[model samples]
Target: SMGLLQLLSNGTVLRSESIDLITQQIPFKNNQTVLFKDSIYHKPNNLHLRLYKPISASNRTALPVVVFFHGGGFCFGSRSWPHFHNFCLTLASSLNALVVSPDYRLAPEHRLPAAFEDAEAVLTWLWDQAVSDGVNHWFEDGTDVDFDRVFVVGDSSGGNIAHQLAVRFGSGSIELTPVRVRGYVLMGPFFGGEERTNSENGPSEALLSLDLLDKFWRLSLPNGATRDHHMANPFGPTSPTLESISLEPMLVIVGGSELLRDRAKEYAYKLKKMGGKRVDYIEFENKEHGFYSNYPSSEAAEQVLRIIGDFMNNLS
Candidate 1:
């Protein structure tokens, strides 16, 4: 039922062939940007993060910070993946924001809370950086970042992590003073449940099949956990309600033909229904999952970047 890769029961991934032709890492093209790769953010996991800064904004203070989490169904992908690498460059330039993308340990081997915890560690690292001036070299170049406007942005399964970060850190669960989470941008957030949504019922052959998605959950979720697990299904009975938590302003982007469109829509709807905060929603017609990242130069991708720029700039 599979090719190119195999998933083992003990959280091991076996890749028979390289999909490099498809997911090749894009080489740096300069583009007036500076990249710092593999800056160790967490010590225990030895996890690192990729930082992208717009060279044109040198010596600029109060630059926004974007903490991006890459998505591979929680079982695959890294900051170096071509789509993510290219997307981060454009995001930094277009928004003129410092983009920090940290690589989380994959699931099965590390499991649910590992990725979540790694993400939290990135924030903690940031807090340490802000409090201790010479602790890291990210700010050594005098590239000042505005933590007050920090945005948690992610796509696919990464979007799910972004939501958790927003709720966990944005609320009083952990105080990240001098580093407030201003907003969150969920791009086709990957969410699932026991019942199939309209898009999921009719699978897409060209991109992200139903079988593959289910396999990812099986290989990534904790042992014996179902699709309704709190991590997989944010709206499921086991997960805490969004209404009970403190959330920042949000922007939910959806592809018109994405398999996960229904869930993204539902999240926006429920959040909006809760009231008290703004939740902007936008759906690009005729678009598919990962359109923005795969084709970062497309018109749809342009609109997405513009929307994100506007969304962040409008935030006080």
Candidate 2:
């Protein structure tokens, strides 16, 4: 497997190696937009955010902000993965928006609600940047960010977060201020349950396995939690009522060959039919999870990029 994962039943853990794999940083692209890092808060350790703005936006005083959360199944992921970094730069340029990826606390060390808390914190950072009279140098320093048009997006586990976080955002459950999330771009939404769907049961070729899927949820959720835990399965009884959420719309991207394909499709349908949410669903036949990351220049990636472009354009 390209991903590094091992059961620690013996208690010997190559934790550093796993972290390195998840957080591998890419060298900055010269032709790409301006990229930099800054932290909003540091309690014992600094919480970091990687920010990027288009190189062509010199004439702009304000731009829509997209707060993206990167995915590595909750156990492993960082804001700095080269592929995800490139994706951010691409979105910044193509979407004509300010893109920021926030680093959340990982599982095993910090589980369940910790990632949720980190996401909430990052949302607050955006609010501060938007409303900070002058204290936020990132804003006061001349970057005009549109406070009303904030968007949330994420891939894999991050997609799970984009959904759950946006629920909190839309429901007013959490006190997220100043900025409003206009939509969510959920890529390969990694949702599941104890009962396997047809895709999960039928496909043996998907890059993921049911065991790994179960392990990720175990590592991320509170102990003794099932795969169908309210947080894990968005359609579960514990999930918020469909009409209760306030999120705008969503773009759900899935692959024909991915293990969670059915769940992704089901989620889009449920959000639209059950919740009255508007969703644009795109599926790339015969592709696997993280298809773009594995083949960033593939034909599939190009087609998906165009779809994303159109989606962002419509939102803008």
Candidate 3:
């Protein structure tokens, strides 16, 4: 019989018992030394957010902020994921930016627009708090946030959410003045089109398998919806055709060795043709999907970080 246990990754299966042991060995305690917290923002479903505001930021002016969404094929993942947690903290510490990582709803239980709606709510909350004079924790006193300098970064499925947010912003579906988002940093974005491309048909172990992609969508989308449904797949035409609103700057980074390479390239080119405010594309020749997540300390991750940092730095 198929069970929830079968749905977990092999690593989780093998290390199930060791997780507690490892946690016992390195327990995380609330001390004045390290900054960390598990906080909840009241949304329709009470969204969860993990904030990592570094000590170095205590004196900085209203710093640029980055809102991150984790990727788990849209069906599984949480803010507690170590890779995401580390990524957020690193952004806060290294970039001197406030990082807000939200725990949006997952699919099968909460399908289609549920997660998107939750994310939008979180963004709304952030916008409100940023503009509010009373909220001094996330922002600097008397220093208004540079809404035009804000950015959205995401990996894989989270990248898809970031794109959806872009489309909505472009179409004026979600009304925020001056478009607070200055750009997007998408890593291994998982926005597969309705049909396959020639490169996708070729032999490539590094690429995301179409069969696996289909399986994930089936598990992540509403039970009766088709794969091409706008809500299920952001690459579908419905969302992009709403209006020809100008998108902010965009940066799409993908691994050339990955199966999604061709699609990523195609999407970047399309984004350029669509006439965004600005566009920059990068493809790492010797990497694969989730490369940053797997080898955070590797040269590839560092290179990616440097590129991202430079991009954010250049954006005014």
lDDT computed for candidate 1: 0.81
**lDDT for each residue of candidate 3 in 1-316, tens digit (9 for 90 to 100):** 1332243332212322322111134476443222556666754587788765666555656667778888877777888887788777767766666677888888778876766777787788776775664345643333334555678888887888888888788777787654388778888877665677665675444335556666667777777767777764455755556327778778898886676778778778876776545778898876768776666666777787788778898887
State the C-alpha lDDT per candidate. 0.81, 0.74, 0.70
Model 3 alpha-carbon drift over 4 Å, by segment? 1-34, 137-148, 177-179, 202-208, 232-239
The full ranking of all candidates by lDDT, starting with the best, is 1, 2, 3
Model 2, residue pairs in steric clash: 62-144
Two-way lDDT contest, 1 vs 2, winner:
1
Q: Output the lDDT of residue 102, model 1.
A: 90
Best by lDDT: 1
Candidate 2 lDDT score at position 84: 81
Compared with the true structure, model 3 gives a TM-score of 0.82
Taking the tens digit of each residue's C-alpha lDDT, what string does model 2 give over 1-316? 3234643232233334422113345698446456455554435447788887775683565778888888877888666788788878777876777788888888878888787777877776666666765324654355667767777778898888888877886677776557767788898887879889988886544347666777788778889888888788987766567666756788999989888889999888877775557787888888878886667657887687677667666765
